[PDB]
Amino acid sequence: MLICKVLKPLVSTNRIPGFEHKHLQVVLDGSSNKVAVDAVGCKPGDWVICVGSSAAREAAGSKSYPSDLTIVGIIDHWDP
Amino acid sequence: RNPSRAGFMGAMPPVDNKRNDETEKPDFLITGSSGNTRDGQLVTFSGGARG
Amino acid sequence: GIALGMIETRGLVPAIEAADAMTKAAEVRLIGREFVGGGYVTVLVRGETGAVNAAVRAGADACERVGDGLVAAHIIARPHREVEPAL
Amino acid sequence: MGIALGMIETRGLVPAIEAADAMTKAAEVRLIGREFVGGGYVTVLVRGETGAVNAAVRAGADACERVGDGLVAAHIIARPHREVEPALGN
Amino acid sequence: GIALGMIETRGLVPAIEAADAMTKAAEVRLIGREFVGGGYVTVLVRGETGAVNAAVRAGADACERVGDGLVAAHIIARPHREVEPAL
Amino acid sequence: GIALGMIETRGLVPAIEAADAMTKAAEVRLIGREFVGGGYVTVLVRGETGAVNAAVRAGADACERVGDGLVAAHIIARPHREVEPAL
Amino acid sequence: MGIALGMIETRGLVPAIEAADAMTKAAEVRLIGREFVGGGYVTVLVRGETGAVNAAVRAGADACERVGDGLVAAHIIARPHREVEPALGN
Amino acid sequence: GIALGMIETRGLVPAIEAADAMTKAAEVRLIGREFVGGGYVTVLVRGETGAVNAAVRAGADACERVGDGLVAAHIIARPHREVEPAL
Amino acid sequence: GIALGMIETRGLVPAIEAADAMTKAAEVRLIGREFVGGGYVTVLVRGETGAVNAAVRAGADACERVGDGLVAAHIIARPHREVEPAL
Amino acid sequence: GIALGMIETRGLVPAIEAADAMTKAAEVRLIGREFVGGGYVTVLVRGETGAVNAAVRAGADACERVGDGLVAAHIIARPHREVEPAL
Amino acid sequence: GIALGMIETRGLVPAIEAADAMTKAAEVRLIGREFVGGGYVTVLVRGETGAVNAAVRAGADACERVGDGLVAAHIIARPHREVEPAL
Amino acid sequence: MGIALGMIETRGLVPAIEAADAMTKAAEVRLIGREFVGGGYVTVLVRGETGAVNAAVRAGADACERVGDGLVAAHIIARPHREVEPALGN
Amino acid sequence: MGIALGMIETRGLVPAIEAADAMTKAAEVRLIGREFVGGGYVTVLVRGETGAVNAAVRAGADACERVGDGLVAAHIIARPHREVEPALGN
Amino acid sequence: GIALGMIETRGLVPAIEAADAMTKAAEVRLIGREFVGGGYVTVLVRGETGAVNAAVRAGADACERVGDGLVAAHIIARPHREVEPAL
Amino acid sequence: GIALGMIETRGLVPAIEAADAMTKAAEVRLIGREFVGGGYVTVLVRGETGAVNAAVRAGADACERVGDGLVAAHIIARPHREVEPAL
Amino acid sequence: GIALGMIETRGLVPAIEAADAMTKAAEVRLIGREFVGGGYVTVLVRGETGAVNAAVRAGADACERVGDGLVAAHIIARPHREVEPAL
Question: Would you call B43 an interface residue with chain L, using a CB distance cutoff of 8 Å?
Answer without folding.
Answer: no
